Q: What sequence folds into this?
């Protein structure tokens, strides 16, 4: 299960089973 | 042809044509029994009907009740006429409805508000008894007199409550209308921000969120995208829990709790119909 979308003009593919890190603000 | 309907104490302008028989469709206005949904040609005929009609609520089982708010589960095979009338009524406010006559494969969840004359129709959603595509809502309507008051979101929440109890992940049937889309986006935002506000761990999978909420993984990702909470930094996908969104949500949560426009899961008394 993968989904594709573009973030900031870049195309990405993301897994629905992998743990995704959660961040508050933190510089990046 | 049909531009208005008389429905209980309300006079409602129709949005779209619905395929009522020509005899009725020829007329400018239809008169509906607000309880059994029979359609009639005049005010005098309606009055005579109301004197005889035994119905003071929808047919089927009342599966949710909190004070004056109920949801009734109506089986399209057991109450064909009622459900056909409901579908024709619904088509007056839907650009496109895939179904009117063959209601037997559907369940209808009809929300009502009670006062001393009976249980008045707020809205409904239909649902296939067996959806190959795992759709938990086929069509959804809040009656015009009740629109923009929070009932649509209550209906949506209720549809996912059924899915949770069924141990299923659900999605609304495509395509979604403009208003349908706005409503679902609003609900998905609420649900996702509540989950992240309550969640304390360092990472989360979409599957876990989907498992908790019964919201489809694709709709969760679409919502994360819509809120610009999916980020990329150092080759990894991060969920960015935005401060403004969380804070704005709590202010909305306060107003949601201020009114009573919420479905309380403790007020559901339901087991999935007929074993199936
Ligand atoms: C499954 C496939 C489908 O059924 S697609 C067809 C969906 N049904 C229809 O289009 C029938 C006609 N429309 C309706 O019945 C209602 O608009 C539906 C979609 C049920 C929403 O019901 P309603 O009771 O008004 O929802 P609600 O008060 O809980 O508000 C939900 C969010 O939607 C917004 N909303 C609502 N109407 C409008 C509108 N005309 N213009 C702009 N925004 C609208 C509300 O503000 C609310 O969003 P928010 O929480 O304020 O951000
Ligand atoms: Cl892909
Ligand atoms: Zn009646």
A:
């Amino acid at each position: 299960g993968m989904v594709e979308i573009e973030i900031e003009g870049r195309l990405h593919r993301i897994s629905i089973f992998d743990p995704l890190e959660i961040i508050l603000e933190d510089d990046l | 042809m049909i531009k208005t309907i008389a429905f209980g104490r309300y006079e409602l302008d129709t949005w779209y044509h619905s395929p009522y028989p020509e005899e009725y469709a020829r007329l400018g206005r239809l008169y509906m029994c607000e309880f059994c949904l029979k359609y009639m040609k005049s005010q005098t005929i309606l009055r005579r009907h109301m004197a005889k009609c035994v119905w003071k609520h929808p047919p089927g089982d009342e599966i949710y009740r909190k004070g004056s708010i109920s949801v009734f589960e109506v089986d399209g095979k057991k109450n064909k006429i009622y459900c056909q009338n409901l579908c024709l009524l619904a088509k007056l406010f839907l650009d496109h409805k895939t179904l009117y006559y063959d209601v037997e494969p559907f369940l209808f969840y009809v929300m009502t508000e009670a006062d001393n004359t009976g249980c008045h129709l707020i809205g409904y959603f239909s649902k296939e008894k067996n959806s190959f595509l795992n759709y938990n809502v086929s069509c959804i309507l809040t009656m015009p007199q009740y629109m923009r008051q929070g009932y649509g979101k209550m209906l949506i929440d209720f549809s996912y409550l059924l899915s949770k109890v069924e141990e299923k992940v659900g999605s609304p049937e495509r395509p979604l209308s403009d208003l349908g889309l706005i409503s679902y986006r609003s609900y998905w935002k609420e649900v996702l921000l509540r989950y992240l506000h309550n969640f304390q761990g360092k990472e989360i999978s979409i599957k876990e969120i989907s498992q908790e909420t019964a919201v489809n993984p694709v709709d969760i990702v679409s919502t994360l995208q819509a809120l610009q909470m999916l980020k990329y930094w150092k080759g990894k996908h991060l969920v960015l829990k935005r401060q403004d969104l969380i804070d704005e949500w709590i202010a909305k949560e306060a107003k949601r709790s201020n009114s009573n426009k919420t479905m309380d899961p403790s007020c559901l008394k339901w087991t999935p119909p007929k074993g199936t």
User: Anything to note?
Assistant: The CA atoms of residues 2 and 15 of chain A lie 5 Å apart. Residues A 2, 4, 13 surround chloride ion (ligand 2) (CB under 6 Å). The two ends of chain A are 27 Å apart (CA to CA).
